[PDB]
Curated annotation (Swiss-Prot):
Tissue expression per record: Isoforms 3, 7 and 8 are expressed in cardiac muscle. Isoform 4 is expressed in vertebrate skeletal muscle. Isoform 6 is expressed in skeletal muscle (at protein level).
Compositional bias ranges of the Polar residues kind: 8-21
Domain notes: ZIS1 and ZIS5 regions contain multiple SPXR consensus sites for ERK- and CDK-like protein kinases as well as multiple SP motifs. ZIS1 could adopt a closed conformation which would block the TCAP-binding site. The PEVK region may serve as an entropic spring of a chain of structural folds and may also be an interaction site to other myofilament proteins to form interfilament connectivity in the sarcomere.
Stated family: Belongs to the protein kinase superfamily. CAMK Ser/Thr protein kinase family.
UniProt organism field: Homo sapiens (Human)
Name under which the protein is recorded: Titin
Source organism, top-level taxon: Eukaryota
Subunit structure: Interacts with MYOM1, MYOM2, tropomyosin and myosin. Interacts with actin, primarily via the PEVK domains and with MYPN. Interacts with FHL2, NEB, CRYAB, LMNA/lamin-A and LMNB/lamin-B. Interacts with TCAP/telethonin and/or ANK1 isoform Mu17/ank1.5, via the first two N-terminal immunoglobulin domains. Interacts with TRIM63 and TRIM55, through several domains including immunoglobulin domains 141 and 142. Interacts with ANKRD1, ANKRD2 and ANKRD23, via the region between immunoglobulin domains 77 and 78 and interacts with CAPN3, via immunoglobulin domain 79.
Regions crossing the membrane: none
UniProt PTM: Autophosphorylated.
Span of the entire protein shown here: 14217 to 14317 of 34350
Known role: Key component in the assembly and functioning of vertebrate striated muscles. By providing connections at the level of individual microfilaments, it contributes to the fine balance of forces between the two halves of the sarcomere. The size and extensibility of the cross-links are the main determinants of sarcomere extensibility properties of muscle. In non-muscle cells, seems to play a role in chromosome condensation and chromosome segregation during mitosis. Might link the lamina network to chromatin or nuclear actin, or both during interphase.
Ranges for domain Fibronectin type-III: 6-101
Disease entry from the Swiss-Prot or TrEMBL record: Myopathy, myofibrillar, 9, with early respiratory failure: An autosomal dominant myopathy characterized by adulthood onset of weakness in proximal, distal, axial and respiratory muscles. Pelvic girdle weakness, foot drop and neck weakness are the main symptoms at onset, but ultimately the weakness usually involves the proximal compartment of both upper and lower limbs. Additional features include variable degrees of Achilles tendon contractures, spinal rigidity and muscle hypertrophy. Respiratory involvement often leads to requirement for non-invasive ventilation support.
Region (Disordered): 2-21
Length: 102
């Protein structure tokens, strides 16, 4: 068995000043072992220090990032983990502003 490929079609909804709902679809290949769950990371748009949002692996295909600072702008990525390892991250989503749409 080997690491899975990245999650695909990472999208967002329900953007607020403190949070955003992320959603994605499973990897095209699981590497021969089932995906245990996903790892969500965020990064302030001007930096390159990615913060892991979730402790326990998310087995679902959605996750609410919280603890955002109002007015800030964030990048997001998600990775898939099986017993063999962790995929490269998905394509980067954003920048997404922590605010209320027009």
């Amino acid at each position: 068995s080997e690491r899975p490929s990245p999650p695909v079609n990472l999208t967002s909804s329900d953007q607020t000043q403190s949070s955003v709902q992320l959603k994605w679809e499973p990897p095209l290949k699981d590497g021969g072992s089932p995906i245990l769950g996903y790892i969500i990371e965020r990064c302030e748009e001007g930096k390159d220090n990615w913060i892991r949002c979730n402790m326990k692996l998310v087995p679902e295909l959605t996750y609410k990032v919280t603890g955002l600072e109002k007015g800030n702008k964030y990048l997001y990525r998600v990775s898939a983990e099986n017993k063999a390892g962790v995929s490269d991250p998905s394509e980067i989503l954003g920048p997404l502003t922590a605010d209320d749409a027009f």
